A paper describes a structure:
Poly(ADP-ribosyl) polymerases (PARPs) are a subgroup of four enzymes (PARP1, PARP2, PARP5a, and PARP5b; PARP5a and PARP5b are also known as tankyrase1 [TNKS1] and tankyrase2 [TNKS2], respectively) that continue the reaction (PARylation) to generate long chains of linear and branched poly-ADP-ribose (PAR) on target proteins. PARP1 is involved in repairing single-stranded DNA breaks making its inhibition an attractive strategy in oncology especially in those cancers that have defects in additional repair pathways. Thus, TNKS activity promotes Wnt/β-catenin pathway, and TNKSs are potential drug targets for the treatment of cancers driven by Wnt/β-catenin pathway, most notably colorectal cancers.
Tyr889 of PARP1 is seen offering van der Waals interaction to the bound talazoparib. In addition, Tyr889 is also poised to make edge-to-face (pi) interaction to the fluorophenyl group of talazoparib. In addition, talazoparib makes a specific interaction with a conserved water molecule. In all structures reported here, a structural water molecule is observed (except for the olaparib-bound structures, where it is displaced by the carbonyl oxygen of the ligand; see later). This water molecule makes hydrogen bonding interactions with the imidazole sidechain of the catalytic His862 and the backbone amide nitrogen of Tyr896 in PARP1 and analogously with His1184 and Tyr1213 of TNKS1. Talazoparib uniquely makes a specific interaction with this water molecule through its triazole nitrogen atom, which serves as a hydrogen bond acceptor.
Numbering used by the authors: 662 to 722, 726 to 744, 748 to 750, 753 to 780, 786 to 1010
């Protein structure tokens, strides 16, 4: 019998759900016999990324293009006829990203005591419940409620549980950025099946093999100041309407503000982050400070920037150590 609070136990079961991993694979139409959950390998996936890079290049740039599409399907077996377009190549990339974390999740799970407590320990994260009556819960609730975008109206968000999280070794890694100017509490959403990898390894940057297309500001860690922009990356459906979103303290420092896409390979010297300027910004006057970190929880208003490719802000760091994960929210998506 696990001594852990029931919301923490429910979180572990949700993270380490094999049925969820298998369901995701069934939806991606992967052959579960030719490519079972336990046989997905990093080497196979990284090599598939490379073929998708050799593919997106031919589309950007027919015997050798079919031979590249066919060599990909040989590498990542599917069961269908097998279906140009960088958006389809980016879908395969995202599938491979989900497949990797699905592999990590299964790897931890498979690789005396209650299975819930044993699986908790594999996450190397200290997970505590934030009380509904606390000042932190109130601030977090206000942040969810106010930063829901007017354009994003496919669902309503409801906070189920708020967890305070301490990833093992992240405190040590963060130390150089601890006193940096412009530290902000920002959103990061992901598929529930990715949270085993995120808690055990932290938020990561896409490998060099992975195609850069899709990464507007290049390969880094992306954050939003509007909950609905990050909540979309949960990919919640009416079927599975419960998602997980992070609140991270991000050491932005001096921001390289951009109004359009730019594949950052090296920031301008003296700059520590990119801020993609959006048309709508959370009201800066309502900006509060939760334990010395800026919390942009104001309601969505015009930033004045009409000359931009973005509707809402996004923040990107290019060093994993600039992120200190603080909270994990369990959100109910109530679709309209
Ligand atoms: C899909 N993905 N994989 C890693 N990071 C992400 C996204 C992302 N995840 N989560 C967020 O909360 C977020 C909040 C933003 F304002 C902006 C974001 C994100 N863009 C990231 C993005 C989008 C498309 C793409 F092709 C590559 C990267």
């Amino acid at each position: 019998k696990s001594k852990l609070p029931k919301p923490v136990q429910d979180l572990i079961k949700m993270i380490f759900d094999v049925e969820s991993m298998k369901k995701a694979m069934v939806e991606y139409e992967i052959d579960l016999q030719k490519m079972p959950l336990g046989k997905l390998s990093k080497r196979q996936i990284q090599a598939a990324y490379s073929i998708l890079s050799e593919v997106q290049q031919a589309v950007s740039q027919d015997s050798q293009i079919l031979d590249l599409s066919n060599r990909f399907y040989t590498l990542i077996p599917h069961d269908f006829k097998p279906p140009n377009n960088a958006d389809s190549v980016q879908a395969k990339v995202e599938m491979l990203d989900n497949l990797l974390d699905i592999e990590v999740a299964y790897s931890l799970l498979r690789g005396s005591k209650d299975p819930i407590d044993v699986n908790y320990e594999k996450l190397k994260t200290d997970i505590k419940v934030v009380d509904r009556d606390s000042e932190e819960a109130e601030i977090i609730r206000k942040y969810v409620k106010n930063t829901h975008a007017t354009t994003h109206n496919a669902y309503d968000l409801e906070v189920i549980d708020i967890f305070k999280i301490e990833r093992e070794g992240e405190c040590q890694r963060y130390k150089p950025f601890k006193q940096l100017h412009n530290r902000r509490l920002l959103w990061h959403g992901s598929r529930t099946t990715n949270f085993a990898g995120i808690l055990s390894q932290g938020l990561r940057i896409a490998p060099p093999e992975a195609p850069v297309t899709g990464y507007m500001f290049g390969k880094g860690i992306y954050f939003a100041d509007m909950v609905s922009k990050s909540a979309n990356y949960c990919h919640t459906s009416q079927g599975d309407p419960i998602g997980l979103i992070l609140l991270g303290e991000v050491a932005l420092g001096n921001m390289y503000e951009l109004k359009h896409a730019s594949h950052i390979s090296k920031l301008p010297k003296g700059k520590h982050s990119v801020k993609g300027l959006g048309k709508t910004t959370p009201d800066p006057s309502a900006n509060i400070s939760l334990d010395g970190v800026d919390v942009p929880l104001g309601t969505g208003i015009s930033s004045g920037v009409n000359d931009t490719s973005l509707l809402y802000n996004e923040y990107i760091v290019y060093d994993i150590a600039q992120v200190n994960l603080k909270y994990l929210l369990k959100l109910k998506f109530n679709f309209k």
